[PDB]
Amino acid sequence: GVQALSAWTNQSGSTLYIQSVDPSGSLSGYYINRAAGYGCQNTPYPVTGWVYGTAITFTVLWENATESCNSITAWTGFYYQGQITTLWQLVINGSTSTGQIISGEDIFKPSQQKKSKTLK
Amino acid sequence: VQALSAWTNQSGSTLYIQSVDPSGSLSGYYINRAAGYGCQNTPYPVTGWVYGTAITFTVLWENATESCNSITAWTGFYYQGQITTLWQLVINGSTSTGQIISGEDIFKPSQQKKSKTL
Amino acid sequence: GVQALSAWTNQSGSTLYIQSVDPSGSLSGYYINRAAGYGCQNTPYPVTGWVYGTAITFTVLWENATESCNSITAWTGFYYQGQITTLWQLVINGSTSTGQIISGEDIFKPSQQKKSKTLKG
Amino acid sequence: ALSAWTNQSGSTLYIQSVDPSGSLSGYYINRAAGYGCQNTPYPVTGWVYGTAITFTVLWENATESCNSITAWTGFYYQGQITTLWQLVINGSTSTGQIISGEDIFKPSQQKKSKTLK
Amino acid sequence: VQALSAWTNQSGSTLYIQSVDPSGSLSGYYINRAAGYGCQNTPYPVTGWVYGTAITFTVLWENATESCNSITAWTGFYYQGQITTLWQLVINGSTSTGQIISGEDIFKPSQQKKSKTL
Amino acid sequence: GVQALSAWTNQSGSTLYIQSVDPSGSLSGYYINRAAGYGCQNTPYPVTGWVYGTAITFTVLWENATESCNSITAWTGFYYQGQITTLWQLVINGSTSTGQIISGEDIFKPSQQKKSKTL
């Protein structure tokens, strides 16, 4: 069951930061995109989602203070063998056909927290 | 796709959009009426995003009367009076992307019955 | 007694679905009215309120995008002897007098939660 | 949006937000003589639907709990909110323990300073 | 520093911490009672962060009864059962750091009081 | 000036990403620290605060799943002449003296949001 203060990096080096998970299962966090061929790289995008045991969904709105890519991604997946294995779907604002929804597979590995006693 | 809208799919399942925030954040609930899926006829919570005509929304299949140990995410777009969606359903305890169920839902808007009193 | 993911059905067949109770006591859930003659039947309405031990309040906005009945109900009650005993107050939009506010008593009995291992079955 | 409502006792309802769903959020200061939980802030939730309103206060905060909850039901009419309220105590056994009455709330005009000084 | 903890400073002002999330997110209210200040004896909203003994919280001096057109931010720490803080107060329309007001507040905890009834 | 979806970068290359400002003035966003000689660099941290015309406070909790620096910063400042001018205070968990609270001045300048039509 994926927990609050967790971070998950995919094969493209994109990271999901889970900042909270309610007892209700409601997930909150942010996402840095580092995938080649995708705009909206390097800056934080908001995340909402659900956790139910090892099942997870999470979706990112591709709009923030620095860059907007006029789109939304939803990942559906499961926690298994220390990684989140997901199928994702990307929809573009102004789409008119299902063929324009891009599909793919992301697998996320957990990062371990580097702890400093001070900002320095 | 604004606050206080409802959308019914080819199976007669309804998404109730309670609010859409300025930030795009979606809040609401969902009634499944699709044959061959459990968790029918009672409301499940929805979160998601709206960005113009693009929408994602996802349902946690646990409520006060029935839990089905799963989550559905819908990805799609509003166009020509309908939300065209692709959905993925994941079961708690899954070990393979082959256990994730996929389909397409077409959501048509409900027209409101307005009464002056309860 | 009153907790997250408990369902409560009154003498008329209406159901409060308590989804969540925060550590703060904040209640979120859903209401389906099934009360004979009343409008806005068999369609879910949002709920907010408070739980404090056996004390509960919860209020339903009778507006969703399918059916709207131009009103708000507030229930005030307590859990005791395996039931929630409530007094409710229903206000209609456009009211001009306290005399137009409708009141009654709802007794809510618990329903147990059904567990399935999948949505497929 | 941001608004303040004061009743016959000088109890003040502070509405901090109203969603487009009509969901109400804010806080409340009780000044009613005889109740405890006076003159400190308590959390508020409710609904607004046209001229109809409900709002309810949990009587627990960092300094004082009174082990109870109040729910107000009413309507906007001639620049005021006319309400019926019901108050339930935790541990109650009977509807006879549910205290009910009426409150009228007038809008509080916002006193603008340009400094905390 | 926890949910439903009350803190009163040398000037009689109280911090009412309503909630602290597992994340460290702080919500609550503030009543100012300090001589020489506007916006006294009505509740203002508080946000901030707790991280072990480290705390920040900040008050917008606007509610629908009295606004003072300013914001305070406290930075401090829980030490020997008290919170020691340095505060900065900024007024709307400021053009110099010299117009920001600074001081020190030491906040003492008050045990939460329990009445049987209301 | 200070609004939903405005980004603000200080003299050290640290960016405040304001995601939303409610009607009430409640600020929600993200921060990426890029300042030479600090921990918790190049990873986003959560922001809460208040906006009241040109007055702003915001505070960053130096904890995420990749890196924690056991501390919190609060910025107090005002938008003026295209810039947010701020004084900041940095408190480390387990401090025992106000002497241990570090301070400085940050000047944040805004970027124009870029619109890419495709991701």
XYZ file of C-alpha atoms in Angstrom:
713
model
C 0.000 0.000 0.000
C 1.884 3.090 -1.425
C 2.272 5.581 1.519
C 2.481 9.398 2.101
C 6.050 10.833 1.762
C 6.959 8.419 -1.025
C 8.624 9.220 -4.375
C 8.648 6.999 -7.486
C 10.907 7.441 -10.560
C 10.023 5.832 -13.926
C 12.364 4.526 -16.699
C 12.372 8.099 -18.293
C 13.542 9.583 -14.904
C 10.137 11.303 -14.270
C 9.256 11.371 -10.526
C 5.906 11.080 -8.680
C 6.076 12.733 -5.180
C 3.176 11.522 -2.943
C 2.794 14.235 -0.270
C -0.306 12.731 1.472
C -2.648 9.680 1.445
C -5.921 10.071 3.481
C -7.409 7.136 5.455
C -10.182 7.597 2.777
C -7.436 6.542 0.223
C -7.281 10.065 -1.381
C -3.735 10.776 -2.767
C -2.149 14.311 -3.112
C 1.237 15.202 -4.553
C 3.189 16.542 -7.481
C 5.077 15.206 -10.508
C 8.247 16.180 -12.417
C 8.168 15.027 -16.099
C 11.641 14.139 -17.524
C 10.441 12.083 -20.583
C 12.035 12.972 -23.990
C 9.358 14.044 -26.606
C 7.041 15.618 -23.982
C 6.820 19.345 -23.071
C 6.308 20.450 -19.430
C 9.666 18.972 -18.228
C 11.637 19.762 -15.034
C 8.883 21.658 -13.071
C 6.201 20.398 -10.588
C 2.656 19.505 -11.777
C -0.220 18.654 -9.407
C -1.436 15.054 -8.728
C -4.708 13.653 -7.394
C -5.480 9.912 -7.193
C -6.577 6.886 -5.129
C -4.752 4.110 -3.277
C -6.634 0.882 -2.383
C -4.160 -1.667 -0.978
C -1.613 -2.128 -3.856
C -3.940 -0.641 -6.554
C -3.207 3.031 -7.486
C -4.487 5.629 -9.942
C -2.946 9.085 -10.216
C -3.476 11.890 -12.755
C -1.410 15.029 -13.518
C -2.847 18.359 -14.856
C -0.170 19.627 -17.327
C -0.583 23.301 -16.209
C 1.658 25.129 -13.707
C 3.104 28.633 -13.155
C 5.945 28.149 -15.740
C 4.535 25.936 -18.513
C 1.156 24.574 -19.716
C 0.886 21.677 -22.230
C -2.908 21.745 -22.640
C -3.252 18.091 -21.473
C -3.800 15.536 -18.615
C -2.265 12.083 -17.964
C -3.879 9.307 -15.908
C -1.814 6.287 -14.679
C -3.521 3.048 -13.528
C -1.324 0.485 -11.791
C -0.296 -1.696 -8.896
C 2.473 -1.930 -6.328
C 4.343 -5.238 -6.763
C 7.961 -6.396 -6.236
C 8.958 -2.921 -4.867
C 7.777 -0.958 -7.949
C 4.564 0.671 -9.286
C 3.727 -0.938 -12.687
C 1.273 1.370 -14.586
C -0.586 1.823 -17.874
C -1.017 5.556 -18.684
C -3.299 7.539 -21.029
C -2.629 11.123 -22.208
C -5.535 13.296 -23.440
C -5.113 16.664 -25.223
C -7.528 19.596 -24.674
C -9.460 20.128 -27.977
C -9.223 16.379 -28.918
C -11.981 15.091 -31.259
C -11.065 11.328 -31.521
C -9.991 8.398 -29.234
C -6.960 7.917 -31.572
C -5.512 11.198 -30.165
C -5.388 9.718 -26.608
C -1.759 8.426 -26.366
C -1.266 5.160 -24.332
C 1.850 3.626 -22.775
C 3.490 1.755 -19.906
C 5.507 3.387 -17.084
C 7.165 1.482 -14.189
C 8.187 3.512 -11.100
C 10.866 2.524 -8.548
C 10.794 4.031 -5.013
C 13.550 6.514 -4.014
C 14.935 6.354 -0.409
C 14.981 9.642 1.628
C 18.431 11.332 1.894
C 18.326 12.947 5.429
C 20.403 16.092 6.308
C 20.266 17.580 9.895
C 20.165 21.138 8.314
C 19.542 23.094 5.044
C 23.277 23.948 5.865
C -18.080 19.952 -18.318
C -18.736 22.370 -15.356
C -19.745 22.005 -11.639
C -23.210 20.438 -11.071
C -23.231 18.371 -14.280
C -24.104 14.657 -14.659
C -23.045 12.246 -17.440
C -24.517 8.768 -18.159
C -22.651 6.100 -20.198
C -23.919 3.441 -22.699
C -24.509 1.122 -19.626
C -26.578 3.788 -17.677
C -23.767 4.487 -15.164
C -23.775 8.189 -14.076
C -20.811 10.469 -13.158
C -22.032 13.305 -10.841
C -19.608 16.289 -11.050
C -20.162 18.202 -7.798
C -17.445 20.904 -8.384
C -14.667 21.934 -10.735
C -12.192 24.343 -9.032
C -10.445 27.243 -10.818
C -7.295 25.001 -10.630
C -9.072 22.300 -12.764
C -9.548 19.990 -9.716
C -12.694 17.730 -10.146
C -14.843 16.446 -7.225
C -17.923 14.198 -7.390
C -19.334 10.693 -7.157
C -20.337 7.821 -9.408
C -23.163 5.250 -9.602
C -22.234 2.043 -11.478
C -25.261 0.363 -13.150
C -23.189 -1.786 -15.587
C -24.145 -5.532 -15.558
C -21.297 -7.900 -14.586
C -19.521 -5.336 -12.357
C -20.174 -5.370 -8.544
C -20.527 -2.130 -6.474
C -23.847 -1.194 -8.283
C -26.569 1.419 -7.473
C -24.629 3.247 -4.607
C -22.320 6.345 -4.817
C -18.463 6.017 -4.925
C -16.065 9.030 -4.640
C -14.450 10.643 -7.772
C -11.372 12.839 -8.109
C -9.890 14.094 -11.369
C -8.874 17.033 -13.517
C -10.532 19.184 -16.209
C -8.401 21.138 -18.726
C -10.757 22.670 -21.346
C -12.410 19.686 -23.059
C -9.789 17.184 -21.617
C -11.031 15.262 -18.484
C -9.630 12.498 -16.238
C -11.700 11.082 -13.401
C -11.118 8.089 -11.182
C -13.406 6.134 -8.790
C -12.382 4.345 -5.573
C -14.748 1.287 -5.396
C -15.160 1.380 -1.587
C -18.144 2.955 0.142
C -20.313 2.376 3.278
C -22.364 -0.517 1.723
C -19.947 -2.281 -0.704
C -16.175 -2.425 -1.471
C -14.882 -4.134 -4.700
C -11.134 -3.874 -3.940
C -10.383 -1.864 -7.150
C -10.010 1.590 -8.808
C -11.135 2.838 -12.268
C -9.447 5.773 -14.091
C -11.256 7.367 -17.119
C -9.313 9.472 -19.639
C -11.164 11.405 -22.364
C -12.545 14.572 -23.959
C -15.799 16.472 -24.289
C -16.821 17.005 -27.922
C -20.128 17.100 -29.878
C -22.314 16.783 -26.716
C -20.531 13.753 -25.187
C -17.476 12.751 -23.123
C -15.592 10.017 -25.073
C -13.460 8.047 -22.476
C -11.004 5.127 -22.296
C -11.032 3.496 -18.821
C -8.595 1.180 -17.006
C -9.732 -0.837 -13.945
C -7.019 -2.141 -11.501
C -7.763 -4.774 -8.752
C -5.937 -4.588 -5.363
C -3.288 -7.420 -5.254
C -2.663 -7.345 -9.081
C 0.783 -8.672 -10.295
C 0.531 -8.167 -14.137
C -0.483 -5.349 -16.575
C -2.474 -8.214 -18.197
C -4.843 -8.163 -15.131
C -5.809 -4.512 -15.831
C -9.223 -4.306 -17.592
C -9.748 -1.686 -20.391
C -12.759 -0.341 -22.283
C -14.358 2.749 -23.803
C -17.310 4.632 -22.207
C -19.374 7.293 -24.037
C -20.954 9.700 -21.488
C -23.998 11.778 -22.499
C -25.196 14.723 -20.360
C -28.349 14.239 -18.180
C -31.045 17.003 -18.414
C -32.071 18.198 -14.885
C -35.601 17.504 -13.484
C -36.211 20.724 -11.380
C -38.925 20.673 -8.603
C -39.684 23.732 -6.344
C -39.935 21.657 -3.064
C -38.997 18.196 -1.643
C -21.371 3.349 16.125
C -20.926 6.436 13.870
C -17.742 5.873 11.811
C -16.230 6.095 8.325
C -17.868 3.703 5.767
C -21.045 2.999 7.822
C -24.514 3.064 6.074
C -27.744 4.043 7.881
C -31.298 3.548 6.554
C -34.290 5.354 8.103
C -37.923 4.095 8.553
C -38.813 5.470 5.014
C -35.976 3.518 3.262
C -33.579 6.508 2.719
C -29.833 5.826 3.187
C -27.006 7.979 4.548
C -23.681 6.655 3.140
C -20.897 8.007 5.488
C -17.772 7.888 3.272
C -15.297 9.591 5.704
C -14.934 10.993 9.257
C -11.655 13.102 9.592
C -9.724 13.089 12.904
C -11.349 16.607 13.225
C -14.886 14.964 13.186
C -15.686 16.335 9.655
C -18.217 14.018 7.890
C -18.457 13.509 4.063
C -20.870 11.126 2.362
C -23.950 10.663 0.217
C -27.703 10.465 0.694
C -30.314 8.582 -1.366
C -33.889 9.629 -0.520
C -36.475 6.776 -0.961
C -39.298 8.464 1.080
C -42.737 7.819 -0.514
C -44.275 10.818 -2.348
C -41.102 13.027 -1.824
C -39.164 14.082 -4.977
C -35.430 13.577 -5.620
C -35.700 9.733 -5.098
C -33.115 7.017 -5.983
C -30.402 9.601 -6.882
C -27.379 10.478 -4.692
C -26.990 13.909 -2.937
C -23.814 15.151 -1.161
C -23.605 15.294 2.673
C -21.427 17.325 5.084
C -21.565 17.387 8.898
C -19.887 16.656 12.209
C -19.449 13.603 14.440
C -18.514 14.007 18.146
C -18.685 10.594 19.967
C -22.395 9.604 19.592
C -23.462 13.165 18.519
C -23.904 13.741 14.726
C -25.112 16.515 12.403
C -25.352 16.069 8.616
C -27.058 18.181 5.911
C -28.039 17.285 2.319
C -28.190 19.784 -0.569
C -31.123 18.513 -2.698
C -29.307 19.477 -5.953
C -27.473 17.219 -8.414
C -27.426 17.641 -12.216
C -30.214 14.962 -12.677
C -32.824 16.011 -10.069
C -33.100 19.185 -7.960
C -35.760 19.862 -5.254
C -34.777 23.470 -4.370
C -34.083 22.714 -0.662
C -31.660 21.726 2.139
C -32.216 19.271 5.042
C -30.236 19.331 8.298
C -30.427 16.290 10.699
C -29.296 16.608 14.356
C -29.151 13.428 16.417
C -27.302 10.838 18.443
C -26.346 7.158 18.258
C -27.924 5.104 21.089
C -29.273 1.509 21.323
C -28.016 0.497 17.813
C -29.754 3.394 15.916
C -29.250 7.128 15.093
C -32.298 9.108 16.417
C -32.511 12.466 14.572
C -34.679 15.603 14.320
C -34.513 17.140 10.833
C -35.315 20.639 9.479
C -36.010 21.104 5.753
C -35.791 24.666 4.307
C -37.114 25.516 0.818
C -35.369 28.150 -1.322
C -37.557 31.296 -1.344
C -38.965 30.698 2.186
C -40.084 33.934 4.035
C -41.155 32.436 7.409
C -39.870 29.858 9.982
C -43.458 28.393 9.610
C -42.494 27.099 6.095
C -39.561 25.078 7.551
C -40.654 21.378 7.779
C -39.493 19.149 10.674
C -39.723 15.477 11.605
C -37.875 12.602 13.281
C -35.771 10.012 11.315
C -34.576 6.764 13.002
C -31.569 5.271 11.138
C -30.511 1.623 11.568
C -27.077 0.380 10.456
C -26.423 -1.769 7.314
C -23.218 -3.973 7.274
C -20.622 -3.368 4.439
C -20.407 -6.128 1.713
C -16.760 -7.013 0.653
C -15.997 -8.242 -2.931
C -12.367 -9.232 -3.961
C -12.863 -7.499 -7.446
C -15.261 -5.179 -9.412
C -15.398 -7.951 -12.158
C -17.377 -10.078 -9.566
C -17.142 34.680 -0.722
C -15.866 36.325 2.565
C -18.744 37.473 4.857
C -19.740 37.854 8.548
C -23.168 37.283 10.218
C -23.908 38.303 13.847
C -27.039 37.165 15.789
C -29.062 38.597 18.769
C -26.342 37.299 21.229
C -23.425 38.789 19.221
C -22.426 35.282 18.033
C -20.663 35.752 14.641
C -20.697 33.346 11.630
C -17.515 33.825 9.449
C -18.004 32.306 5.927
C -14.482 31.931 4.418
C -15.615 30.133 1.171
C -18.652 28.872 -0.823
C -17.827 26.284 -3.644
C -19.881 26.315 -6.880
C -21.461 23.093 -5.417
C -22.814 25.440 -2.646
C -20.507 23.823 -0.017
C -19.924 26.232 2.896
C -16.713 26.512 4.957
C -15.742 28.907 7.776
C -15.760 29.411 11.580
C -18.043 30.670 14.366
C -17.629 32.644 17.666
C -20.382 31.887 20.223
C -21.324 34.836 22.488
C -24.615 33.301 23.752
C -24.910 33.848 27.573
C -25.252 30.402 29.319
C -23.461 28.223 26.768
C -19.758 27.497 27.359
C -17.376 27.417 24.339
C -17.692 31.219 24.192
C -15.518 33.829 22.407
C -13.198 31.333 20.593
C -13.349 30.008 17.029
C -15.112 26.745 16.106
C -15.205 25.101 12.663
C -18.272 25.453 10.362
C -19.556 23.415 7.386
C -22.892 23.777 5.529
C -24.844 24.274 2.274
C -26.244 27.369 0.485
C -28.935 26.959 -2.229
C -30.381 30.276 -3.448
C -31.919 31.860 -0.276
C -31.731 28.558 1.747
C -28.798 27.889 4.145
C -27.687 25.217 6.638
C -24.538 25.442 8.750
C -23.266 23.363 11.658
C -20.554 23.928 14.276
C -18.541 21.292 16.160
C -17.967 22.599 19.742
C -14.370 21.381 19.986
C -11.252 23.493 19.495
C -7.732 23.766 20.980
C -8.921 25.541 24.238
C -12.415 24.120 25.012
C -14.752 21.276 23.971
C -18.421 21.286 25.044
C -18.966 17.736 23.769
C -21.808 18.962 21.417
C -22.781 20.122 17.885
C -25.312 22.739 16.659
C -27.084 22.788 13.252
C -28.825 25.947 11.964
C -31.480 25.784 9.198
C -32.906 28.927 7.554
C -33.116 31.516 4.781
C -32.077 35.072 3.712
C -35.060 37.540 4.077
C -34.839 41.438 4.186
C -31.032 41.617 4.666
C -30.962 38.990 7.492
C -30.733 35.161 8.017
C -33.739 33.789 10.041
C -32.722 30.354 11.482
C -33.935 27.461 13.637
C -31.035 25.697 15.452
C -30.747 22.286 17.119
C -27.959 21.353 19.601
C -27.078 17.752 20.427
C -24.837 16.628 23.284
C -22.507 13.606 22.922
C -23.911 10.779 25.160
C -27.564 11.824 24.518
C -30.295 9.136 25.125
C -33.493 11.054 24.053
C -34.667 13.708 21.548
C -35.801 15.607 24.719
C -32.082 16.390 25.310
C -31.855 18.120 21.848
C -31.971 21.879 22.590
C -33.763 23.954 19.861
C -34.371 27.673 19.365
C -34.239 30.515 16.836
C -31.413 32.925 15.863
C -31.533 35.983 13.556
C -28.233 37.032 11.928
C -27.553 40.527 10.418
C -24.639 41.073 7.998
C -21.551 42.582 9.789
C -20.031 45.585 7.870
C -16.192 45.034 7.483
C -14.114 47.642 9.486
C -11.127 48.436 7.125
C -7.793 49.490 8.688
C -4.799 50.080 6.268
C -2.300 48.970 9.030
C -2.094 46.645 12.052
C -0.300 49.894 13.254
C 2.962 20.679 18.647
C -0.281 18.805 17.783
C -3.922 19.133 16.663
C -6.153 21.000 19.191
C -3.254 22.671 21.019
C -3.682 26.319 22.178
C -0.668 28.717 22.543
C -0.819 32.143 24.199
C 1.980 34.753 23.833
C 3.398 37.396 26.292
C 0.786 39.877 24.791
C -2.280 37.601 25.528
C -2.790 36.560 21.843
C -3.809 32.908 21.240
C -2.879 30.441 18.456
C -5.695 27.822 18.131
C -4.138 24.878 16.164
C -7.279 23.032 14.832
C -5.386 20.337 12.829
C -1.879 19.056 12.055
C -1.821 16.524 9.165
C 0.705 13.642 9.106
C 2.405 15.683 6.260
C 3.096 18.525 8.873
C 0.418 20.863 7.364
C -1.040 23.155 10.115
C -4.545 24.747 10.057
C -6.223 26.906 12.672
C -7.152 30.310 14.064
C -5.480 33.258 15.785
C -7.002 35.858 18.124
C -4.812 38.972 18.497
C -5.056 40.719 21.908
C -1.737 42.733 21.702
C -1.960 46.470 22.654
C -0.891 48.813 19.822
C -2.341 46.526 17.079
C -5.550 46.568 15.016
C -7.566 43.372 14.376
C -8.034 42.428 18.086
C -10.530 39.946 19.637
C -11.780 38.343 16.348
C -10.481 35.079 14.781
C -8.107 35.142 11.753
C -7.088 32.005 9.765
C -3.651 30.331 10.193
C -1.683 28.077 7.811
C 1.834 26.651 8.195
C 4.146 23.718 8.840
C 5.373 21.586 11.788
C 8.607 19.495 11.421
C 9.617 17.957 14.758
C 9.969 21.029 17.023
C 10.323 23.472 14.040
C 7.088 25.461 13.253
C 5.999 28.253 10.858
C 2.479 29.697 10.851
C 1.099 32.855 9.255
C -2.104 34.905 9.735
C -3.954 36.971 7.106
C -5.336 40.016 9.042
C -8.572 40.029 7.004
C -11.989 38.695 8.076
C -15.469 40.092 7.152
C -15.693 42.114 10.478
C -12.187 43.717 10.539
C -9.268 43.858 8.086
C -5.864 45.452 8.777
C -4.496 45.015 5.239
C -1.452 42.936 6.439
C -0.050 39.399 7.103
C 2.216 38.091 9.927
C 4.612 35.074 9.579
C 6.087 33.442 12.714
C 9.198 31.208 12.504
C 10.122 29.288 15.640
C 10.582 26.052 17.602
C 9.042 24.049 20.471
C 11.821 23.795 23.166
C 11.047 23.320 26.943
C 7.216 23.148 26.641
C 6.931 26.658 25.048
C 7.184 27.908 21.386
C 9.846 30.661 20.815
C 9.197 32.555 17.542
C 10.499 35.506 15.479
C 7.649 37.193 13.547
C 7.637 39.452 10.436
C 4.500 41.612 9.664
C 4.077 42.968 6.107
C 1.443 45.600 5.155
C -0.263 45.651 1.721
C 1.244 48.415 -0.533
C 4.751 48.123 1.073
C 7.703 49.348 -1.052
C 10.637 48.915 1.469
C 11.909 46.097 3.836
C 12.120 48.951 6.454
C 8.241 48.978 6.499
C 8.229 45.224 7.511
C 7.743 44.929 11.327
C 9.698 42.302 13.355
C 9.628 41.009 16.928
C 9.788 37.993 19.206
C 6.764 36.078 20.653
C 7.058 33.318 23.377
C 3.877 31.173 23.343
C 2.787 29.167 26.461
C 0.452 26.117 26.062
C -3.070 26.099 27.647
C -4.560 22.647 28.582
C -7.766 22.061 26.505
C -10.840 22.476 28.812
C -13.671 19.827 28.822
C -17.341 20.691 29.722
C -19.894 17.795 30.021
C -22.596 19.744 28.009
C -23.168 23.035 26.022
C 1.031 40.722 -9.899
C 0.905 37.836 -7.349
C -1.664 35.326 -8.678
C -2.481 31.659 -9.426
C 0.033 30.174 -11.948
C 2.769 32.802 -11.450
C 6.442 31.618 -11.115
C 9.059 33.639 -9.183
C 12.856 32.962 -9.274
C 15.251 34.538 -6.709
C 18.861 35.797 -7.252
C 20.160 32.206 -6.373
C 17.973 30.456 -9.058
C 15.313 29.109 -6.563
C 11.733 29.106 -8.044
C 8.396 29.626 -6.193
C 5.691 27.930 -8.342
C 2.318 29.396 -7.151
C -0.333 26.826 -8.297
C -3.460 28.490 -6.797
C -4.707 31.429 -4.714
C -8.278 31.036 -3.308
C -10.592 34.097 -2.939
C -9.636 34.025 0.853
C -5.964 34.641 -0.199
C -4.792 31.091 0.616
C -1.658 30.253 -1.432
C -0.744 26.693 -2.592
C 2.338 25.812 -4.603
C 5.743 24.257 -4.938
C 9.343 25.388 -4.474
C 12.630 24.223 -6.019
C 15.767 25.310 -4.125
C 18.789 25.771 -6.440
C 20.941 27.927 -4.101
C 24.680 26.964 -3.883
C 25.616 25.640 -0.388
C 22.138 24.446 0.764
C 20.715 20.916 0.987
C 17.419 19.864 -0.604
C 18.336 21.217 -4.133
C 16.599 20.393 -7.477
C 13.599 18.634 -5.828
C 10.140 20.203 -5.254
C 8.858 21.082 -1.745
C 5.286 22.091 -0.747
C 4.271 25.756 -0.110
C 1.438 27.295 1.897
C 0.903 31.006 2.565
C -1.286 34.096 2.167
C -1.595 36.833 -0.498
C -3.298 40.170 0.441
C -2.944 42.669 -2.481
C 0.893 43.082 -2.732
C 1.602 41.504 0.706
C 2.640 37.772 0.614
C 3.872 35.186 3.114
C 4.875 31.689 2.017
C 6.591 28.878 3.892
C 8.346 25.747 2.573
C 8.661 22.475 4.533
C 12.096 21.042 3.602
C 10.779 17.424 3.488
C 9.887 15.167 0.493
C 10.499 11.400 -0.119
C 13.818 12.086 -2.030
C 15.494 14.513 0.483
C 14.751 16.199 3.852
C 16.767 18.991 5.531
C 14.992 18.908 8.916
C 13.885 22.598 8.652
C 11.316 25.182 7.498
C 11.661 28.561 5.741
C 9.085 31.396 5.914
C 9.229 34.387 3.484
C 7.530 37.722 4.278
C 7.425 40.320 1.482
C 5.612 42.603 -0.956
C 5.217 42.758 -4.745
C 6.593 46.108 -6.103
C 8.304 47.233 -9.349
C 7.936 43.809 -11.097
C 9.652 41.980 -8.149
C 8.672 40.251 -4.852
C 11.076 41.601 -2.172
C 11.153 39.213 0.864
C 12.827 38.675 4.221
C 13.134 35.000 5.123
C 13.653 33.056 8.333
C 14.953 29.446 8.334
C 14.321 27.348 11.519
C 16.054 23.909 12.020
C 14.140 21.143 13.993
C 15.596 20.785 17.587
C 16.760 24.461 17.743
C 17.030 25.837 21.347
C 17.738 29.598 20.652
C 16.423 32.338 18.229
C 20.189 32.778 17.518
C 19.953 29.486 15.491
C 17.227 30.958 13.205
C 19.023 32.022 9.963
C 17.747 35.002 7.899
C 18.321 36.778 4.580
C 16.605 38.805 1.818
C 15.335 37.181 -1.403
C 14.229 39.130 -4.477
C 12.015 36.956 -6.760
C 11.441 38.030 -10.400
C 8.537 36.567 -12.437
C 8.668 34.407 -15.607
C 5.882 34.452 -18.292
C 4.084 31.041 -18.307
C 5.075 29.304 -21.644
C 2.192 27.689 -23.621
C 3.183 24.419 -25.409
C 0.009 23.161 -27.276
C 1.296 19.498 -27.232
C 3.084 17.704 -24.315
